[PDB]
């Protein structure tokens, strides 16, 4: 079925005009979309962010030392997407999907876009089920429902992560006791942290079981 | 011999533009200026776009004329590493600045590398 | 010891006090040294202090 | 307009030369009748493009070093801060109200230097070494750069001698 | 006053002049006449130093610069579009735009002759029927009645098929990439099963 | 190369095309 | 012709009142940049200006 319907699609090219500081200005790529993943010939990916009349401004997903002036940029045709599904549970991925824990590919997973429109008015209902964090300063005084976004704001070394790690570890303690439908699956996004800081959290989530 | 030996295009303080008429050096590559009073190494920072690279001087640019021959070394700044560097003083480009002679190099490593991976990390307190 | 953007007098101070306490050894005893010094002190241009 | 496409325009591709030869017999007589309005062209000298705020932009000066004393034809010194592709930005050691657009800038061949020696001892100079005390020029003196790099680690020793100030609070 | 419409649209201030110089040369069918008028001035700057001094030197007076070009573009080689362009570009000191107003003029000209310059690079050299076959395959990729000017090259890293290099797009009909996408699909599908 | 001095142009006017346009289009017959 | 010096005084020839400008900088392309000592309302591009 794949070989009987196989047209090798026309790949639109582009030349790197300039490159530096993780930005590559790209000549050409005339049919590229805004926010579309592009691929450099060095293997490093990119995202077309501001389409201008003379060039494309491409933010580079990685080190820009491998991109030269006059390098070829191919557009992938696709907006930026990540692998979603239950095969991401248990795994440590980077900023786009790719697992960095050394456990092979993400089995049992499916790609979907990272920039999805939020559900509108008619797609919701009121936040009524409780989200137990296990922190009694939170669960008594500032309680949190399911579907509620709650800002943990504080100064430099307060207990901000420790409130959020306790909300994740507590969901492991509740998931063993609730039925399968009302189990909470946690995602911790670690932006701009140390790599050994997040290695201390994978070690903590393993030896707790979260 | 003229290609991959470009010339100084414009000098603004610590920042040198060098135009290479063919096959530009990579970003972070080391470039040597010929004919300076001292050894002037230029690390490539950006590709400006018109066969011009944008460089950072590792020493003073006082004395750079706008045609000066700049030689690409094809690699980043490589400094001597090893047990033979123990007890010596080095500067930014790996030269001995303690007047004890040349540095015993077990290897010479570029000063630009990636961080260790997430699997390589150590969680021991 | 990577000295980045500090006083050259302090680099000379640390170098001479390490030769005194035998952390740095000169001449043919150089292989028994324990410290290596890299210096980009505050008289250097900005490109040197950015890479040292 | 790609540089790949501007590189092919070095090769001749006219395939007809019916006005190459027409103006090349007429260009020089038309240039010759406007010689009163030509300033002499400038290559190794400089000509001031624009002066203002104590920074002049200087066309030409093809062989100036970065950080070099230049001399405007009105006798005011400058320092070539940034050599650009099209101009040189010089910094005027003086008031820029005497520099005009179209003034000649002269390279001096030396990075910014002051007279040092035993003969400057006793004198009152300005920020560039010219005396202002009125007792004549600096004699028994030689020129040295003002932006020397400081001595390194190995060129120093620790301070031992006690440099008395004469103030009891300081010396105690 | 509406002009002919340009074949392709271009960016500004040097290709915006070429878009208009093309339009007042397609009004009098002087598209090929003013093109080598442009190419002769590219050559005249390679010869004459006092003609390129009227485009680099900022200290030539604008009275002089508009009266050298007006006093040599007379009684021969005028074309009255070239003669009025270079006296307009000498008014504003924009004679240095002559190189890139020429380059973007060709990009309107080459899209007006409806040729797409091509590059077909295959595994082994072509015989007569393969050429007629992949030429018929490749003319389904030009977005007009464009006259493809196929170039032929050899790369045995392809194991048969062809890859077409349009310098703006690339369609890789080779069998090495067919094998690679086959293996990627197989390794993709056996991990979902 | 002796044509490198004309490689990139410099303009004293953002509305250069507004001056070229009033001198190119009246030049047709 | 030739430019006036910086800080030189220029008289705008033909105006309601005496409009003196003082040359602040040479902008290049034979233009000087001036700062007026009276109101500039009523001033036309191309008005004659006499350098004193
Ligand atoms: N509830 C708590 N009881 C005792 N100690 C705590 C508690 N919460 C946090 N700490 C201690 O405070 C320190 C800072 O905690 P945490 O890592 O949460 O800081 P943070 O707010 O995340 O700041 P940063 O993001 O800079 O690390 C931790 O070392 C932890 O040991
Ligand atoms: Mg934290």
PDB file of C-alpha atoms in Angstrom, chain D:
ATOM      1  CA  UNK D   1      20.005  39.526  -5.913  1.00  0.00           C
ATOM      2  CA  UNK D   2      22.270  36.599  -5.112  1.00  0.00           C
ATOM      3  CA  UNK D   3      26.039  36.921  -4.944  1.00  0.00           C
ATOM      4  CA  UNK D   4      26.077  33.840  -7.165  1.00  0.00           C
ATOM      5  CA  UNK D   5      24.169  36.040  -9.620  1.00  0.00           C
ATOM      6  CA  UNK D   6      26.357  39.106  -9.023  1.00  0.00           C
ATOM      7  CA  UNK D   7      29.491  37.024  -9.618  1.00  0.00           C
ATOM      8  CA  UNK D   8      28.467  36.147 -13.179  1.00  0.00           C
ATOM      9  CA  UNK D   9      28.376  39.865 -14.004  1.00  0.00           C
ATOM     10  CA  UNK D  10      32.162  40.072 -13.890  1.00  0.00           C
ATOM     11  CA  UNK D  11      32.200  38.089 -17.128  1.00  0.00           C
ATOM     12  CA  UNK D  12      31.355  40.225 -20.188  1.00  0.00           C
ATOM     13  CA  UNK D  13      27.931  39.426 -21.612  1.00  0.00           C
ATOM     14  CA  UNK D  14      26.947  42.489 -23.625  1.00  0.00           C
ATOM     15  CA  UNK D  15      27.097  40.918 -27.151  1.00  0.00           C
ATOM     16  CA  UNK D  16      27.019  44.461 -28.647  1.00  0.00           C
ATOM     17  CA  UNK D  17      29.319  47.389 -27.889  1.00  0.00           C
ATOM     18  CA  UNK D  18      27.602  50.279 -29.653  1.00  0.00           C
ATOM     19  CA  UNK D  19      27.801  52.592 -26.641  1.00  0.00           C
ATOM     20  CA  UNK D  20      30.873  51.284 -24.883  1.00  0.00           C
ATOM     21  CA  UNK D  21      32.892  52.927 -27.653  1.00  0.00           C
ATOM     22  CA  UNK D  22      30.519  55.888 -27.851  1.00  0.00           C
ATOM     23  CA  UNK D  23      31.096  57.121 -24.325  1.00  0.00           C
ATOM     24  CA  UNK D  24      34.682  55.864 -24.018  1.00  0.00           C
ATOM     25  CA  UNK D  25      35.569  58.414 -26.699  1.00  0.00           C
ATOM     26  CA  UNK D  26      33.373  60.988 -24.919  1.00  0.00           C
ATOM     27  CA  UNK D  27      33.869  60.305 -21.199  1.00  0.00           C
ATOM     28  CA  UNK D  28      37.288  61.953 -20.761  1.00  0.00           C
ATOM     29  CA  UNK D  29      36.327  65.256 -22.534  1.00  0.00           C
ATOM     30  CA  UNK D  30      33.211  65.500 -20.356  1.00  0.00           C
ATOM     31  CA  UNK D  31      35.219  64.812 -17.193  1.00  0.00           C
ATOM     32  CA  UNK D  32      37.854  67.359 -18.289  1.00  0.00           C
ATOM     33  CA  UNK D  33      35.370  70.221 -18.558  1.00  0.00           C
ATOM     34  CA  UNK D  34      34.489  69.712 -14.878  1.00  0.00           C
ATOM     35  CA  UNK D  35      37.866  69.923 -13.172  1.00  0.00           C
ATOM     36  CA  UNK D  36      37.133  73.122 -11.249  1.00  0.00           C
ATOM     37  CA  UNK D  37      34.501  71.172  -9.301  1.00  0.00           C
ATOM     38  CA  UNK D  38      36.556  68.027  -8.645  1.00  0.00           C
ATOM     39  CA  UNK D  39      38.254  67.787  -5.316  1.00  0.00           C
ATOM     40  CA  UNK D  40      41.416  65.692  -5.858  1.00  0.00           C
ATOM     41  CA  UNK D  41      40.694  61.997  -5.264  1.00  0.00           C
ATOM     42  CA  UNK D  42      41.838  60.471  -2.028  1.00  0.00           C
ATOM     43  CA  UNK D  43      43.296  57.019  -1.395  1.00  0.00           C
ATOM     44  CA  UNK D  44      46.017  57.058   1.257  1.00  0.00           C
ATOM     45  CA  UNK D  45      44.996  60.428   2.602  1.00  0.00           C
ATOM     46  CA  UNK D  46      41.569  60.992   4.059  1.00  0.00           C
ATOM     47  CA  UNK D  47      38.697  63.343   3.485  1.00  0.00           C
ATOM     48  CA  UNK D  48      36.162  64.161   6.186  1.00  0.00           C
ATOM     49  CA  UNK D  49      32.749  62.806   5.239  1.00  0.00           C
ATOM     50  CA  UNK D  50      30.915  64.156   8.256  1.00  0.00           C
ATOM     51  CA  UNK D  51      31.980  65.679  11.557  1.00  0.00           C
ATOM     52  CA  UNK D  52      29.786  66.101  14.593  1.00  0.00           C
ATOM     53  CA  UNK D  53      29.731  65.416  18.353  1.00  0.00           C
ATOM     54  CA  UNK D  54      33.525  65.162  18.350  1.00  0.00           C
ATOM     55  CA  UNK D  55      33.588  62.150  16.005  1.00  0.00           C
ATOM     56  CA  UNK D  56      34.531  62.549  12.361  1.00  0.00           C
ATOM     57  CA  UNK D  57      33.797  60.048   9.617  1.00  0.00           C
ATOM     58  CA  UNK D  58      36.736  59.977   7.230  1.00  0.00           C
ATOM     59  CA  UNK D  59      36.626  58.638   3.695  1.00  0.00           C
ATOM     60  CA  UNK D  60      39.753  56.953   2.435  1.00  0.00           C
ATOM     61  CA  UNK D  61      42.802  56.464   4.669  1.00  0.00           C
ATOM     62  CA  UNK D  62      43.328  53.050   3.126  1.00  0.00           C
ATOM     63  CA  UNK D  63      46.365  52.135   5.212  1.00  0.00           C
ATOM     64  CA  UNK D  64      45.609  53.521   8.666  1.00  0.00           C
ATOM     65  CA  UNK D  65      46.113  51.246  11.619  1.00  0.00           C
ATOM     66  CA  UNK D  66      43.369  50.849  14.165  1.00  0.00           C
ATOM     67  CA  UNK D  67      44.026  53.160  17.081  1.00  0.00           C
ATOM     68  CA  UNK D  68      46.345  55.512  15.223  1.00  0.00           C
ATOM     69  CA  UNK D  69      47.001  59.246  15.536  1.00  0.00           C
ATOM     70  CA  UNK D  70      45.635  60.971  12.467  1.00  0.00           C
ATOM     71  CA  UNK D  71      46.150  64.660  11.844  1.00  0.00           C
ATOM     72  CA  UNK D  72      43.510  66.891  10.362  1.00  0.00           C
ATOM     73  CA  UNK D  73      44.915  69.585   8.093  1.00  0.00           C
ATOM     74  CA  UNK D  74      43.931  72.230  10.652  1.00  0.00           C
ATOM     75  CA  UNK D  75      46.463  70.643  12.997  1.00  0.00           C
ATOM     76  CA  UNK D  76      44.008  68.859  15.271  1.00  0.00           C
ATOM     77  CA  UNK D  77      44.879  65.309  16.177  1.00  0.00           C
ATOM     78  CA  UNK D  78      42.516  62.379  16.038  1.00  0.00           C
ATOM     79  CA  UNK D  79      42.521  58.665  16.721  1.00  0.00           C
ATOM     80  CA  UNK D  80      41.178  56.113  14.266  1.00  0.00           C
ATOM     81  CA  UNK D  81      38.830  54.150  16.500  1.00  0.00           C
ATOM     82  CA  UNK D  82      36.900  51.985  14.068  1.00  0.00           C
ATOM     83  CA  UNK D  83      38.031  51.297  10.546  1.00  0.00           C
ATOM     84  CA  UNK D  84      34.943  50.441   8.533  1.00  0.00           C
ATOM     85  CA  UNK D  85      34.585  49.178   4.991  1.00  0.00           C
ATOM     86  CA  UNK D  86      33.542  52.584   3.633  1.00  0.00           C
ATOM     87  CA  UNK D  87      34.930  55.086   6.149  1.00  0.00           C
ATOM     88  CA  UNK D  88      37.125  55.457   9.203  1.00  0.00           C
ATOM     89  CA  UNK D  89      35.576  56.754  12.371  1.00  0.00           C
ATOM     90  CA  UNK D  90      38.112  58.991  14.063  1.00  0.00           C
ATOM     91  CA  UNK D  91      37.840  60.547  17.504  1.00  0.00           C
ATOM     92  CA  UNK D  92      38.925  64.167  17.623  1.00  0.00           C
ATOM     93  CA  UNK D  93      41.425  65.174  20.323  1.00  0.00           C
ATOM     94  CA  UNK D  94      40.175  68.726  20.343  1.00  0.00           C
ATOM     95  CA  UNK D  95      37.140  70.756  19.431  1.00  0.00           C
ATOM     96  CA  UNK D  96      35.386  69.574  16.292  1.00  0.00           C
ATOM     97  CA  UNK D  97      34.290  73.120  15.409  1.00  0.00           C
ATOM     98  CA  UNK D  98      37.446  73.518  13.301  1.00  0.00           C
ATOM     99  CA  UNK D  99      36.945  70.321  11.270  1.00  0.00           C
ATOM    100  CA  UNK D 100      34.863  70.702   8.116  1.00  0.00           C
ATOM    101  CA  UNK D 101      33.429  68.241   5.658  1.00  0.00           C
ATOM    102  CA  UNK D 102      35.972  67.926   2.891  1.00  0.00           C
ATOM    103  CA  UNK D 103      38.956  68.582   5.124  1.00  0.00           C
ATOM    104  CA  UNK D 104      42.076  66.528   4.560  1.00  0.00           C
ATOM    105  CA  UNK D 105      43.030  63.924   7.147  1.00  0.00           C
ATOM    106  CA  UNK D 106      46.627  62.787   7.279  1.00  0.00           C
ATOM    107  CA  UNK D 107      47.800  59.459   8.579  1.00  0.00           C
ATOM    108  CA  UNK D 108      50.892  59.779  10.767  1.00  0.00           C
ATOM    109  CA  UNK D 109      51.933  56.133  10.783  1.00  0.00           C
ATOM    110  CA  UNK D 110      52.019  55.774  14.556  1.00  0.00           C
ATOM    111  CA  UNK D 111      49.532  54.567  17.139  1.00  0.00           C
ATOM    112  CA  UNK D 112      48.612  57.317  19.660  1.00  0.00           C
ATOM    113  CA  UNK D 113      51.728  58.283  21.554  1.00  0.00           C
ATOM    114  CA  UNK D 114      52.988  60.903  23.982  1.00  0.00           C
ATOM    115  CA  UNK D 115      56.489  62.275  24.687  1.00  0.00           C
ATOM    116  CA  UNK D 116      58.059  60.360  27.569  1.00  0.00           C
ATOM    117  CA  UNK D 117      61.479  60.785  29.105  1.00  0.00           C
ATOM    118  CA  UNK D 118      63.539  62.868  31.504  1.00  0.00           C
ATOM    119  CA  UNK D 119      62.605  66.052  29.711  1.00  0.00           C
ATOM    120  CA  UNK D 120      58.917  65.959  30.442  1.00  0.00           C
ATOM    121  CA  UNK D 121      59.858  66.111  34.124  1.00  0.00           C
ATOM    122  CA  UNK D 122      58.789  69.503  35.401  1.00  0.00           C
ATOM    123  CA  UNK D 123      56.292  70.327  32.692  1.00  0.00           C
ATOM    124  CA  UNK D 124      52.565  70.920  32.455  1.00  0.00           C
ATOM    125  CA  UNK D 125      51.092  69.174  29.433  1.00  0.00           C
ATOM    126  CA  UNK D 126      47.643  68.546  28.033  1.00  0.00           C
ATOM    127  CA  UNK D 127      46.052  65.116  27.602  1.00  0.00           C
ATOM    128  CA  UNK D 128      48.192  64.308  24.556  1.00  0.00           C
ATOM    129  CA  UNK D 129      51.608  65.578  25.616  1.00  0.00           C
ATOM    130  CA  UNK D 130      51.783  69.053  24.207  1.00  0.00           C
ATOM    131  CA  UNK D 131      52.986  71.487  26.872  1.00  0.00           C
ATOM    132  CA  UNK D 132      50.678  74.198  28.162  1.00  0.00           C
ATOM    133  CA  UNK D 133      53.005  75.899  30.644  1.00  0.00           C
ATOM    134  CA  UNK D 134      54.384  78.126  27.890  1.00  0.00           C
ATOM    135  CA  UNK D 135      58.084  77.348  28.350  1.00  0.00           C
ATOM    136  CA  UNK D 136      58.639  75.820  24.937  1.00  0.00           C
ATOM    137  CA  UNK D 137      58.518  72.333  23.470  1.00  0.00           C
ATOM    138  CA  UNK D 138      59.337  69.094  25.228  1.00  0.00           C
ATOM    139  CA  UNK D 139      63.072  68.549  24.800  1.00  0.00           C
ATOM    140  CA  UNK D 140      65.150  65.517  25.847  1.00  0.00           C
ATOM    141  CA  UNK D 141      62.164  63.287  25.259  1.00  0.00           C
ATOM    142  CA  UNK D 142      61.032  60.380  23.117  1.00  0.00           C
ATOM    143  CA  UNK D 143      57.739  59.038  21.845  1.00  0.00           C
ATOM    144  CA  UNK D 144      55.981  56.050  23.364  1.00  0.00           C
ATOM    145  CA  UNK D 145      52.524  54.536  23.068  1.00  0.00           C
ATOM    146  CA  UNK D 146      49.731  55.369  25.496  1.00  0.00           C
ATOM    147  CA  UNK D 147      47.934  52.030  25.287  1.00  0.00           C
ATOM    148  CA  UNK D 148      50.711  49.698  26.358  1.00  0.00           C
ATOM    149  CA  UNK D 149      49.548  46.436  27.876  1.00  0.00           C
ATOM    150  CA  UNK D 150      50.326  46.004  31.551  1.00  0.00           C
ATOM    151  CA  UNK D 151      53.100  43.605  32.609  1.00  0.00           C
ATOM    152  CA  UNK D 152      52.139  40.001  33.087  1.00  0.00           C
ATOM    153  CA  UNK D 153      52.359  37.687  36.050  1.00  0.00           C
ATOM    154  CA  UNK D 154      56.008  36.731  35.612  1.00  0.00           C
ATOM    155  CA  UNK D 155      57.161  40.338  35.189  1.00  0.00           C
ATOM    156  CA  UNK D 156      56.095  41.313  38.710  1.00  0.00           C
ATOM    157  CA  UNK D 157      57.136  40.828  42.298  1.00  0.00           C
ATOM    158  CA  UNK D 158      55.283  41.581  45.511  1.00  0.00           C
ATOM    159  CA  UNK D 159      55.482  45.053  46.968  1.00  0.00           C
ATOM    160  CA  UNK D 160      58.114  45.411  49.659  1.00  0.00           C
ATOM    161  CA  UNK D 161      59.237  49.019  49.740  1.00  0.00           C
ATOM    162  CA  UNK D 162      57.082  51.289  51.900  1.00  0.00           C
ATOM    163  CA  UNK D 163      56.346  54.553  49.872  1.00  0.00           C
ATOM    164  CA  UNK D 164      55.819  57.123  52.608  1.00  0.00           C
ATOM    165  CA  UNK D 165      52.927  59.510  52.067  1.00  0.00           C
ATOM    166  CA  UNK D 166      53.624  61.975  54.853  1.00  0.00           C
ATOM    167  CA  UNK D 167      50.119  61.677  56.257  1.00  0.00           C
ATOM    168  CA  UNK D 168      49.956  60.176  59.744  1.00  0.00           C
ATOM    169  CA  UNK D 169      46.616  58.487  59.125  1.00  0.00           C
ATOM    170  CA  UNK D 170      47.862  56.948  55.884  1.00  0.00           C
ATOM    171  CA  UNK D 171      51.348  55.924  56.982  1.00  0.00           C
ATOM    172  CA  UNK D 172      50.089  54.496  60.272  1.00  0.00           C
TER     173      UNK D 172
END
